[PDB]
Structure formats: structure tokens, C-alpha cells
């Protein structure tokens, strides 16, 4: 069979295929309370009906002021557990595994009131200057990721992913372009990584399941982070028990990025090879042929699909056809698939 | 602008495009109570997110023993109103109009216990022989369609379609092959049409909105009904205020049917021309080009899509692309569509 | 088997499928002598390798001043026979049948010097006013079509098509908008049809094989010709022994034409039904599904494909795949098809 | 613009895009004299009309007994020059550059009479045992490649490619599995490479244009050649002035090969990186997205397309559409592309 449709086991979780619905913000929590809405349910569950092996729920803030927008999903409150519990139950009932992306927007939070970051440096010209987190505020945030993970476990998620990419809080700490701290959380690569190190260790105190970490493998900026730096971080994450690194890139600051089909795959293959860590490839992957090639040539272990799943919720079926192979259809659509 | 994406107003309902999700049974009411489940919600709402102009909910039984299977949706009880109320609200919120198909499986009901029909004639050698409805029972069934329509109105549906096709109860009364009654509901075309006539008149006492009727325009059998018969019924339906005839075919009895792309279009075109009645074309229509041709050549007014919407929930986008035109995308997917 | 890939026999010619490469001018006779060039050979033969059932060569002038442009193909001289003989042999060798479209551009000829027409009326404000053909000149032109047909037979063509459409010479005689003659070739429909009648009768004196006539089934203009007129001409053509009417439309004069997929199909269906004449459907037919529908619903006998064959020379294979059926591939490409 | 459609210059040859028609035997020289036929002309020229940047003509034997089959093209005689001269002229006239693959089947020659190889070892159970080439016979063959190159230059080819792959003669000398010689052409890697070294040096005495070499980057067999060996050969070829290595694989002997989209790309990228040599990627590349990714991620410099160009001669257009970009169409098809 095609590798794209061959199961893979990570910890005590077996995925029926290697297609992953990349986390994508829907800005649909209209009550601004971080809760799920009917749209979210239809949005996610339809891709489970569509046979996506693993569905990763969009960035969910671990702190209200850590949201990107006031319409973001949240997991900073026990009040969020009930809705997520229904979502995981329904997604899994359709045959897919489900994960959640724990996040904090840091200096990129588009909210009124003080926003936070490792250093008081604004994202750009049109952004507010963030407040430099006190050492204790940083430690409180670590606890919030821990608390959020505990809620995710209770809600029934199969996988937890830490959002350490796209110029958000953790990414801000990792990069010297945004982290000018002179305390235990700044300076050396080890210190810049400390925030993430503590988040991983604390999350593991309440979560023993598959743990993913999404990173921006490059800042595409002089004096910023590059793949070499991330290969280093990957080795440390492996030692800590991280199961897979979801390889994205950019967004820490404005930069020129050459975008094209599979433009971030090199990051996934280099980390996989040099850090001996399973990786997720993402970035303009839109057809089954590319997906199969990435897996067969050992460039990544899972294929994250974003925008193509917005155009085609049933990408799994489309990819199967493109690869001239057969996959099980949801029972209700046996007469059409 | 392409005709497929041109609005049409029926009564007080304006459809934003001519794409209709054909009613398709999902056999997913696992509690065997005819109620909706999370699967149904995601299944239908996803096509609304997908911009389908009109979504018609699958055959919903007006009487429990009128179900095709014990996992069919139902609308025989006021308890069914709550679920449907949530569904219509959520579908309309995405920007689509919604309808429901009122039905009764007649002799094709796959349930334990007596099943009913106009005459005690089994569908085939593998089916149970139905019980001939008493005149009283027939009139009670008319009232159940009326009562069901009332529930549909309360639930917020935009359109109601009467299922008078696919060999089910109403179709059984219409055809001489299945109706050998010696009372007012059998014999001449007037008598054979009487059941449907009374259903339409009664439904109109509680529902003044768009009213569709799906028929099997031919039995493809000697001594059975053919397009000439249905043109006759269509003229009577027009006088009664039916707004559109959804043109399907067959299934009253086993028959040899030449299936091919647009194989039922001739029925929609003839009824449209000869009965001066708006029609819905359905049957192996899988792309925007065929849909546009059918509309532009005046063969039908609405394009019903069945299986292609099971393969591609976002057929509307796919069709827009095939026709080299643009249509509004759901706000949440503007970065992908 | 799909009707699109079902054989059909016209006279003594059996076509292996119903796909026809519509005649399309290539304006590539760079020596301005109407002779074939390597481009023409590869252009046509590639579609034969592509399994097209019948390839009709572009408009070939029966008189040099009857060319549309000075780079048109010609068949006004015996010197044109050698090239055509090689082309028909090579096309047939690949397994396809081949035809040629005999033509005369009339007032739409874009050449230096006097151009001719039934009446001195220019095509539009940008065109030169043609010279009214003397009765002698008209009869000489009839002989040139006859002589051209003789050359086509000698060159080995399987089918000959008379170009009586797109506002060219013959079409000009047929329509009241362009024909104001006061002799035997103008006035009543009998007189306006006379030019074509004589061409058909004379051609038949030297050619007994399949004979096609392409017409513009409507002028889309007040006081111009419409489908009713062409149904009348079609009945006369049937009596004369014409085997099939290739149904196109317009171009006699500028007009508002609603173009859409299958916009000329109604013409092919009406002529087929009312004149009991085999017809070729053409006009925005781009996929196997539409082609199959047209054939199965009895709207035409052959499917003429134009621009789609310019985008996809191997449309036959593409259509077979779309129809989920199999067709023989050229032996040399068995490892790819 | 897309890299796939950006020109690239090699020596004094500029390709308009980076799509290459991979050499593919057509077994169509029916007279068994190695000459071109009308089919060959239509076959190749149609892809030039189709905008393929570089068309590489199928394996052409440098010696009659070096043909794979008696229906192969040849270039062992001056009698072959005339036909090739017409072919290059016509392909270039349509806008493409053209190359020819100089070949010798060695022990895989399916011809009657003695066949040759470095050692008397048969390809398999159903193959004849080849005659071990005397040192002089090897030197004569080197001269034949030289002579063939001289003919190719006279015929007007833009590129010459040496076929050192697919288990044929040169490949046989390169691999220790098939080369057991104990003279100057066997033993060490240097000696096994000597035959190719001499062919390259001699060809360069009569040809100063772009020179490609196709290799089988792996024998997929224990004790056979692997990518490490070919990276070594690549460095030697670079020193000799070879411009690009066309990276295929296998066929020396029967072996288990895992085939999938882009299954030979790793060979192209490793040789490109470690030998600092331009490379051509080939092997189940069927869409523009994969092609663009290969080029943008620096895995190869040219994209060789084989079977997809047999299914779609106009792959260039299809790929352009897939990449949402525009490319010039042949003037004759401007109204369709
Ligand atoms: C509407 C939208 C919302 C997104 N939200 C998130 C998010 O919450 N978390 C994240 O890590 N990436 C997010 N992304 C980035 C995507 O997950 C994905 O990595 C990116 O689009 C590259 O992949 P693609 O080409 O398959 O879409 C978003 C992208 C889009 C288009
Ligand atoms: C799984 C399935 C369930 C269906 N259930 C219904 C139904 O409840 N009512 C109805 O009128 N037609 C029903 N149909 C018939 C379809 O609505 C449609 O008319 C038929 O599939 C022809 O169209 P298509 O070729 O676009 O699928 C069903 C079809 C399928 C495949
Ligand atoms: C470049 C080009 C040249 C054409 N030349 C001719 C011609 O010589 N004779 C003719 O009858 N139609 C000619 N046509 C009209 C086509 O045969 C065909 O009827 C028309 O394109 C409608 O079909 P299509 O939508 O499949 O392309 C031409 C069309 C194109 C695009
Ligand atoms: C019919 C056919 C003939 C071929 N002949 C040759 C040849 O003469 N020389 C060569 O180097 N490769 C030859 N090949 C191998 C192809 O060039 C190509 O490298 C292979 O098919 C892998 O690519 P693809 O997946 O794009 O077809 C041939 C392949 C096919 C299907």
C-alpha cells in the first residue's frame, strides 16, 4: 500500500494514515470567551468524516491575554473542558485521532491591555510594545501550559502540541532577535531554550501521551535563528521526550520568504536526520504525490495539510485516487466514494 | 455571471445559487428514535459552509413504520422539532437555505412488523408482503404528512419536499403496477393521484412556503408509469400550487435502467416545457459544466447534486473553478479558497 | 461500453469512437501556397496517435482567393494532392479516419485584391466590400468545389465536409442578410439554397463516400436565419444524400451570442429529430461526461471537439478515464496510458 | 515566476524552461535500419509544439549490434544524418532544444548473433551469454561513440547524452557485478570507469556543446554499485567537463526496487551536493508541484518527464496551470491554451 495510508504508532496512539490536519485558527469564538461553537464542531468533525488520520485543533490560548485575537479558542479555564470533551468524543467516533495546540501569542497578541514577551520589543511598526515578563510571570505561564495540558487530557485529546512557532511567546524566547533578557531565561542558547524546557517538563508531569512541538525552523533573518539552531533544540527536545517536531517557519519579524510547494520540507528532513527525531512536514503540500514522496524519501513521518483541507475537506479520498490506491470510506458515503 | 451561480426566488425564498444537495439517507439515527446525531449535524452543516444554495435533508419518516430502516431520521413526533430547529438555524447561519423531505417507505420499509401499501403486493421476492391500507389508514397517513409539515415549519425549514418517488408509499399509489385498489384511491389516474392530491392540499393548510415534490418520472416497465403520465400529474400539481418538481426515476420495481451522465435530464426538461412547471434535474451530474449546460439550455431550474457532494462537500467551489468564475467563500476559509 | 467509444458506420466508413477533431485553421502555410508543413503533420497526426476517431482537416480553400488568410491550407491545385496523400496515409496508419473541410471564405477573405460574395455587402465596417459574383462566377465556384472533392478523394480522405457556415461564401448565399441577389441564386429559400444544392449534386458526381455539411444553425439576428430555416435546409440536404450535418452557429455578421457549455447542442438535437438527419454537436464540449450525455440522450451522433483538443491532444484517453472505461492505447505508449 | 518555467543556460544553450522529455524508446524503426519514420516525427515534434524546453531523443545505437531491439533508432551510419537533420530543424522551429541519447545495449541487446559485454556474464536466465569484448573491441566502441557524436553534431543536435545506465554496455563496465575484467578496463573503480572516461574524452574531441550522462545511481544489489560509488564517478565526470548527470537507477540485474513518486530524486540531490554537479531528476514525477519543489529545494537543475508526457504531450501547459502561472503557448493554439 501507499505509505501515506499506512498506520503509524506514536506512544500508545496509532494513526490509521499519515495525513494530519494542520492547526488553523478559525476566529469563530464570537462570545470572546474561548469556547467552541457549532461552526467549530462542523468544521473539525467533517474532516474526521473525511478520514484525516489526526486532526490538530487550532491554537488555543493558555491565558486570556495569550490569545491572538478575542475570537480565538481557549483552554485557560475549566469551563473549556466540557466543549472539548464533546469535540474529541465526536471526532474520535468518526475514526480520527485528535490533538490540540497549546498556545500563547506573546507580543503578537491583538488584544487591549498589556501584552507580554521576553523583552520589551514590538513585533513591528503597527504593534504595541509588550511588557517584559518578570521571572515570576514566566514561571506562571509555564504553569499555565501545564494546567492547560491537564485540561486537554481530561477533555480526551490524543495528542498535545506546544506552539513554539510563528513569532509567538515561546518562539520569542528562543530567538536572540526578540530575547534580550539577562536572567536565567536569556543570553545563551540554553537559557533561551529554558522556557520551552520547563514547559515540556511540566507538561510531562500531567501528560504521558504523544507530545508534539511546532517550531519556526528559521527566522530568515541575519542574527536570527536558522536550521542549525533548531537542530540543536531538536536534540534537547528528544532528550526530554518530545515525540515529534512539527516543522513550520518564520513570523518572528517581517522577512522575505520564498514560498513554493514543499518550501519547509528541508527543515523537517534535516531535523529528522541530524536530531534523530520524528518530524511533521508542512507548507504548500497539496497533493498525494508530494505527500507520498516526502514520506518515502524519509524527509518526514507525518504530512500536515493546511489550506488544501480548507479547499477539500476530503483530501484523504482525493489523495488516495491520485495515488491509485483504495482507503476505507466513512460507512455513510460508501455509495459515493 | 454563470447561471449556476445566479439567484432564483421561489415564493418568498431566494436561493443564492442553483446548487441543491439532493436528499440522501444516512442511516445514522443509531438510537432508532429518528433523532439527529452529531454526525448528521457535521454532515449537513459542512455543505452549508461549502456554499450549497439549498440543502435538502434526507427522507424523514412521517410515521415510524414509514421509515426505510430503523436508523432513518424522523419527523413523526414533536420531539423531533428541537434537533431540527438547531440544524436549520446552523445551516442558515452559514448562508444556505434548507429543506426537508417528508416520506413514508410504504412496502419498501425494512422494519419488523406489518408494513403498509396501497395493495398487498410485495416489492420483490426478497421482501415481505405489505398490508393493504384501509381507507381510514390512508386518510390518517395524509394527516401525518400534514402534521409533519407543521413540525417542519416550526423547526424553521425553508422548503418542504414531498417524497412521491423511488417506489415508496406515494409512488406506490400513483402506479398501476403497485396499486390495484378498488376504492377512491385506485383505478383511474385521478383516483391513483388522489393520495398525493390530498397530501398537497392538507400540507398547504399548514404550510404556505416553497413546496417541492420529488417523483420517479418513469417505472421503466410495461404497463407502468412513463413520462407522459408524469406530465399529466405535473399539470395537476401546478394547479394545486406545487412550486417545483424534483425529477428522479425508477425503483418502484426492479427494472433495466440505462444509467449515464444526466440520464434523468430528459424528464426534467419535458415536465418543465409541457407542464410549465419549474423542475429540478438530478442523476449523475458531477461537474459545473454539465450543470451550467442544463440550466442555460432551459432543461431545468435547479441542479440537484447527490453523490458528487459525498465525494466533494465543497462542490460549489470546484464548480466555480471549472466555470472560470468567482463565488464568495465562507469567511473562515478566505485564505484557502 | 460507453456510447462515446461505440463505433458508428456512415456509408462504408466505420468510426471506432464518436470523437471528432473539429476543423480548426492553423494559419501555418507560411509559403502562402496552401501546402502542408511539418507543423501541420505533427499537429494532426498527434491526435491520431491520440485515438481520435475522426480528424477533420481545417478549412481548405477551393480557390486561392477563397482563403481566409494567405497562410491557409488549400486544395485548389493538384499540387496539393501529394502532401494530403501523405497526411491521410499517416493519420490512418495510427488508426483514425480522416476528413477535409472544403471551403471558400467569400466576403470574409482577408486577402489583397477583389474578394467575392453573393452581394456587394461588407461583413463589417472594418472589411472590404466584396464584388458580387456573376452567375458565371458562381457556377465556376460550384465546379471548384467539385474539383476539390475529386482531389480529396484522390488524396485518400475518408470524409468530405462542405463548409456552409461561419459567414463564409455558402452561408452568405443561404442568408437573406447577406444575399440580395435578383437571379436564380437569391430570393426564396429554394433560390438561396441553390448554390449549396448544386455543390452537393456536383460533389456527388465525383465522391460517393461520407458527405458532411457544416452549417451555422442561426444568425442570431432579426431577419436572419434561425433554427427553423436550417431544419428546412436539412430536410433538403437529406434528400440530396448528405450523411450528417455538423451544427455550429453564427459569424455571418456580428451578433450577441450567449456562449456556455453545449450552447449549440439544441441545434444538433432539433435538426436530428425534425429532419431525421445524423448530426454532429460542437461548441464548448470539454469533457467525456458531457459528450456521453449528448450521445445517450440522443441529441447528436458525433461529438466534435475543438479547443479542448488544442489543450489536450489525448482527450480520448482523458475522456475514457472520466467515464471510468478503457480504450486501446497507441502501441508505443502502452507503458504510459 | 515559477522556477520550472525560468530559463537556464548550459554552455551556449539556453533552455526556455526546465522541463525535459526523458529519452523513451519507441521501437518504431520498422525497416530495422535505425532510421526515423513519420511516427517518430509526429511523436517528438508534438512535444515541441507542447513547449517542452528540451527533448531528448530515445536511445540511438552507436553500433547495429548495440541496439536493444531491431526496431531501435540508430546513429551508427552517416545514412542516419539526413533524417536527424530534419528532426532537429523541425523541433527547434517549434521552439524547443533537442538532444540525442547515444547508446549501446551490451549484454541486454535482444538481437541474433553474438552480443557484447565487459565479461561473459548473462543478464539473466532468459538471456544469451555475451562475448567478452577484447581490449580492441572496447576501443573500437569508444570510437563509435565518438563517431556517433560527430554525426549528432552535424545533424544539428543541441545536447548529447551518453547512456551509461539501465544495465547497458557502459553500466556493465562500471559495476563489479558485471565487470570481472582483469585488464585496464576492470578491477579498480578507476579501471571500471575507464571506458566511460575514454568515451567522454573522445566525444569532446568532436563535440564542444552541452554533454549529459545518464547513470543508474544504484544497482540495489549487495556488492553492486550504490550512490556513494556514483558520487565518486560524478566528481570524475565533472573534472572531465560533463555538464549534467541524468540520474536514473537499476536494471543491471533483476532487483527489488521500491517505486514511488520521486523515488530517484535522492540520487540527483546527493550527486548535486557532494559532486557539485548539475543534475537531472527523473522517476515518477507527474505534476508541476513536485517539479517546482525539486528545483526550489535544490535537489536537481532539470526535471525529466517520461510517462506523463506519453499521457499528456502538453504537460508544460498542465503544469503551468497547476502552478497558477502563465507560459507562452504555441501561436497556433493561442485561442485554446
Ligand atoms: C486560516 C488559517 C489559520 C491558521 N492558524 C494557525 C494556528 O492556529 N496554529 C498554527 O500553528 N498554524 C496556523 N496556520 C498555519 C498553518 O497551520 C499551516 O502551517 C500553513 O498554512 C502552511 O501550510 P499549508 O500550505 O498546507 O496551508 C494557519 C493558516 C491559515 C490559512
Ligand atoms: C447513500 C444514498 C442515500 C439516498 N437517500 C435518498 C433519500 O432519502 N431520498 C431521495 O429522494 N433520494 C435519495 N437518494 C437518491 C439521491 O438523492 C439522488 O437522486 C441519486 O443519487 C441520483 O443522483 P446523483 O447521481 O447526483 O447521486 C440517495 C442516494 C445515495 C447514494
Ligand atoms: C484556432 C481556431 C481555428 C478554427 N478554424 C475553423 C475552420 O477552419 N473551420 C470550421 O468550421 N471551424 C473552425 N473553428 C471553429 C471550431 O471548429 C469549433 O467549431 C469551435 O471552436 C467551437 O468548438 P470548441 O468549443 O470545441 O472549440 C476554429 C476554432 C479555433 C479556436
Ligand atoms: C516506453 C518507454 C521507453 C523508454 N526508453 C528509454 C530509453 O531509450 N533511454 C532511457 O534512458 N530511458 C528510457 N526509458 C526510461 C525513461 O526515460 C524514464 O527514465 C523512466 O520511465 C522513469 O520516468 P517516468 O516515471 O517519468 O516515466 C523508457 C521508458 C518507457 C516507459
What residues of chain C lie within 8 A of the CB of B286, using their CB? 289
Q: Which of B38, B42, B311 comes nearest A314 by C-beta?
A: B311
Alpha-carbon dihedral of residues C123, C126, C129, C133, nearest 10 degrees? Answer: -40
Angle subtended at Cα D208 by Cα D234 and Cα D217, rounded to the nearest 5 degrees: 20
* Domain count of the fold of chain B: 1
For A314, the grid coordinates are 476530503
Nearest residue CA, atom 29 of ligand 2?
B24
Ligand closest to A105 (CA) is 1
- State the nearest Cα–Cα gap between B207 and chain A, in angstroms: 28
Task: Find the helix or strand (DSSP H, E) in which B309 lies.
Answer: helix B308-311
| CATH code of A78's domain | 3.20.20.70
B145 touching A (Cβ < 8 Å):
no
Contact criterion met (CB < 8 Å) for B336 and A311: yes
Q: Pick from B204, B200, B290, B287: which is nearest to B245 by CA? A: B200
Find out whether D121 and D129 touch, Cβ atoms under 8 Å: yes
Distance CA B105, CA B89 (A): 28
D65 burial level (CB within 10 Å; 0-12, 13-18, 19+): middle
Ligand closest to A247 (CA) is 1
Q: Pick from B296, B212, B271, B246: which is nearest to B6 by CA? A: B296
Helices (H) and strands (E) in chain C, counts: 10, 13
- Cβ neighbours of residue C59 under 8 Å, at least 6 residues apart? C23, C25, C68, C72, C73, C101, C103, C105, C163, C168
Q: Which residue of B has its CA nearest to A332?
A: B26
Chains B and C contact (Cβ–Cβ under 8 Å for 3 or more pairs): yes
**Resolution in angstroms, to 1 decimal, for this deposition?**
1.8
What residues of chain A lie within 8 A of the CB of D293, using their CB? 260-263, 265, 290
Q: Please tell me which chains touch C, using 3 or more CB pairs under 8 Å as the contact test.
A: B, D
First-to-last CA distance in chain A?
Answer: 18
For C192, the grid coordinates are 438561396
SS3 state at C128: coil
Distance B22 CA to ligand 2 centre (A): 6
For D223, the grid coordinates are 556488492
Contact criterion met (CB < 8 Å) for B292 and C261: yes
Check pocket membership of B261 for ligand 2, CB cut-off 6 A. Answer: no
Output phi, psi for A101, to 5 deg.
-100, 110
Distance CA D181, CA D179 (A): 6
Distance B98 CA to ligand 1 centre (A): 31
Number of residues written out for chain B: 337
For B173, the grid coordinates are 399509489
Q: Which of C3, C258, C289 comes nearest B287 by C-beta?
A: C289
DSSP code for B54? E
Distance D74 CA to ligand 4 centre (A): 17
Number of residues written out for chain C: 337
Q: Pick from B28, B303, B23, B301: which is nearest to B163 by CA? A: B23
A199 burial level (CB within 10 Å; 0-12, 13-18, 19+): buried
Q: Which residue of D has its CA nearest to A265?
A: D297
Q: Please tell me which chains touch D, using 3 or more CB pairs under 8 Å as the contact test.
A: A, C
Check pocket membership of D248 for ligand 4, CB cut-off 6 A. Answer: yes
Of ligand 2's atoms, which has the minimum distance to the CA of residue B304?
26
Distance CA D250, CA D236 (A): 21
Q: Pick from B283, B280, B278: which is nearest to B246 by CA? A: B280
Is A22 a known ligand-binding residue? yes
- State the nearest Cα–Cα gap between A337 and chain B, in angstroms: 6
D45 touching C (Cβ < 8 Å):
yes
Is A42 a known ligand-binding residue? no
Q: Which residue of B has its CA nearest to A331?
A: B26
Find out whether A214 and A250 touch, Cβ atoms under 8 Å: no
Ligand closest to A283 (CA) is 1
Find out whether D175 and D106 touch, Cβ atoms under 8 Å: no
DSSP code for C245? E
Beta-bridged to residue A61, according to DSSP, are A74, A103
Task: Find the helix or strand (DSSP H, E) in which D57 lies.
Answer: strand D54-61
Radius of gyration of chain D (CA): 19
Range(s) of the domain holding residue D202: 1-337
Dump the DSSP string for D278-305: -EEE-SS--SHHHHHHHHHTTS-SEEEE
What residues of chain C lie within 8 A of the CB of B259, using their CB? none
Check pocket membership of B107 for ligand 2, CB cut-off 6 A. Answer: no
- Cβ neighbours of residue C40 under 8 Å, at least 6 residues apart? C26, C28, C29, C73, C87
First-to-last CA distance in chain C?
Answer: 19
Output phi, psi for D302, to 5 deg.
-130, 150
SS3 state at B163: strand
C297 touching B (Cβ < 8 Å):
yes
Helix axes B38-49, B81-93, angle to 10 degrees: 20
Alpha-carbon dihedral of residues C178, C184, C190, C196, nearest 10 degrees? Answer: -70
Neighbours of B283 (CB within 10 A): 20
For D329, the grid coordinates are 503557448
For C222, the grid coordinates are 432579426
Distance CA A49, CA B193 (A): 41
Q: Which of C46, C317, C333 comes nearest D46 by C-beta?
A: C46
Check pocket membership of C265 for ligand 3, CB cut-off 6 A. Answer: no
Q: Pick from A223, A200, A196, A210: which is nearest to A153 by CA? A: A210
Pairing mode, strands C13-15 and C8-10: antiparallel
Nearest residue CA, atom 10 of ligand 1?
A23
C312 touching B (Cβ < 8 Å):
no
For C164, the grid coordinates are 456552409
Handedness of CA C73, C75, C77, C81 (dihedral sign): positive
Contact criterion met (CB < 8 Å) for A290 and D286: no
What residues of chain C lie within 8 A of the CB of D90, using their CB? 38, 42
Give one word for D50, left, alpha or beta, with left for phi > 0 and alpha for psi -120 to 50: alpha
Distance CA C66, CA C162 (A): 14
Helix axes C189-206, C227-239, angle to 10 degrees: 40
What residues of chain D lie within 8 A of the CB of A297, using their CB? 262-263, 265-266
Q: How far is CA A335 from the centre of its chain?
A: 35
Check pocket membership of C305 for ligand 3, CB cut-off 6 A. Answer: yes
Output phi, psi for A108, to 5 deg.
-100, 10
- State the nearest Cα–Cα gap between C11 and chain D, in angstroms: 29
Distance CA D25, CA D37 (A): 13
Q: b/e for B10-40, b at 16 or more Cβ within 10 A?
A: beeeebbbbbbbbbbbbebbeeeebbbbbbb
Distance CA D77, CA C180 (A): 67
Contact criterion met (CB < 8 Å) for B260 and C290: no
Check pocket membership of C58 for ligand 3, CB cut-off 6 A. Answer: yes
Contact criterion met (CB < 8 Å) for A261 and D3: no
Best mutation target, B47, B73, B310, B329, to test chain A (most A CBs within 10 A):
B310
C18 touching B (Cβ < 8 Å):
no
DSSP code for C99? E
A261 touching D (Cβ < 8 Å):
yes
- Cβ neighbours of residue A183 under 8 Å, at least 6 residues apart? A135
Dump the DSSP string for B18-30: SEEE--------T
Instruction: Looking at A155-208, list the stretches that DSSP marks H as alpha helix, in order from N- to C-terminal side.
Output: 169-174, 189-206
Q: How many CB pairs under 8 A join A and D?
A: 53
SS3 state at C74: strand
Distance CA D178, CA D121 (A): 7
D26 touching C (Cβ < 8 Å):
yes
First-to-last CA distance in chain B?
Answer: 19
Distance CA A267, CA A250 (A): 12
- State the nearest Cα–Cα gap between C205 and chain B, in angstroms: 40
Amino acid at each position: 500500500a501507499r505509505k501515506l495510508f499506512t498506520p503509524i504508532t506514536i506512544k500508545d496512539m496509532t494513526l490509521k494514515n499519515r495525513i494530519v490536519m494542520s492547526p488553523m485558527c478559525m476566529y469563530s469564538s464570537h462570545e470572546k470567551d474561548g469556547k467552541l461553537t457549532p461552526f467549530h464542531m462542523a468544521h473539525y468533525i467533517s474532516r474526521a468524516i473525511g478520514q484525516v488520520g489526526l486532526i490538530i485543533v487550532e491554537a488555543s490560548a493558555v491565558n486570556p491575554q495569550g490569545r491572538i485575537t478575542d475570537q480565538d479558542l481557549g483552554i485557560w479555564s475549566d469551563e473549556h473542558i466540557e466543549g472539548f470533551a464533546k469535540l474529541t468524543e465526536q471526532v474520535k467516533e468518526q475514526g480520527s485521532k485528535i490533538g490540540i495546540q497549546l498556545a500563547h501569542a506573546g507580543r503578537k497578541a491583538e488584544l487591549e491591555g498589556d501584552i507580554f514577551a521576553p523583552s520589551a520589543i514590538a513585533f513591528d511598526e503597527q504593534s504595541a510594545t509588550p511588557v517584559e515578563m518578570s521571572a515570576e510571570k514566566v514561571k506562571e505561564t509555564v504553569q499555565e501550559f501545564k494546567q492547560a495540558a491537564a485540561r486537554a487530557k481530561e477533555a480526551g485529546f490524543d495528542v498535545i502540541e506546544i506552539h513554539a512557532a510563528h513569532g509567538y511567546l515561546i518562539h520569542e524566547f528562543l530567538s536572540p532577535l526578540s530575547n534580550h533578557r539577562t536572567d536565567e531565561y536569556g543570553g545563551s542558547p540554553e537559557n533561551r531554550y529554558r522556557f520551552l524546557r520547563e514547559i515540556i517538563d511540566e507538561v510531562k508531569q500531567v501528560w504521558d501521551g504523544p507530545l508534539f512541538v511546532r517550531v519556526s525552523a528559521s527566522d530568515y533573518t541575519d542574527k536570527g535563528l536558522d536550521i542549525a539552531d533548531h537542530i540543536g533544540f531538536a536534540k534537547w527536545m528528544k532528550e526530554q521526550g518530545v515525540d515529534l517536531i512539527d516543522c513550520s517557519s518564520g513570523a518572528l519579524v517581517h522577512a522575505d520568504i520564498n514560498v513554493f510547494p514543499g518550501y519547509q520540507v528541508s527543515f523537517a528532513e534535516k531535523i529528522r536526520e541530524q536530531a534523530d527525531m520524528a518530524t511533521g512536514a508542512v507548507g504548500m503540500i497539496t497533493d498525494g504525490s508530494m505527500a507520498e514522496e516526502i514520506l518515502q524519501n524519509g524527509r518526514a513521518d507525518l504530512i500536515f495539510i493546511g489550506r488544501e483541507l480548507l479547499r477539500d475537506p476530503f483530501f484523504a479520498r482525493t489523495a488516495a485516487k491520485q495515488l491509485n490506491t483504495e482507503i476505507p470510506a466513512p460507512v455513510q458515503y460508501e455509495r459515493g466514494w
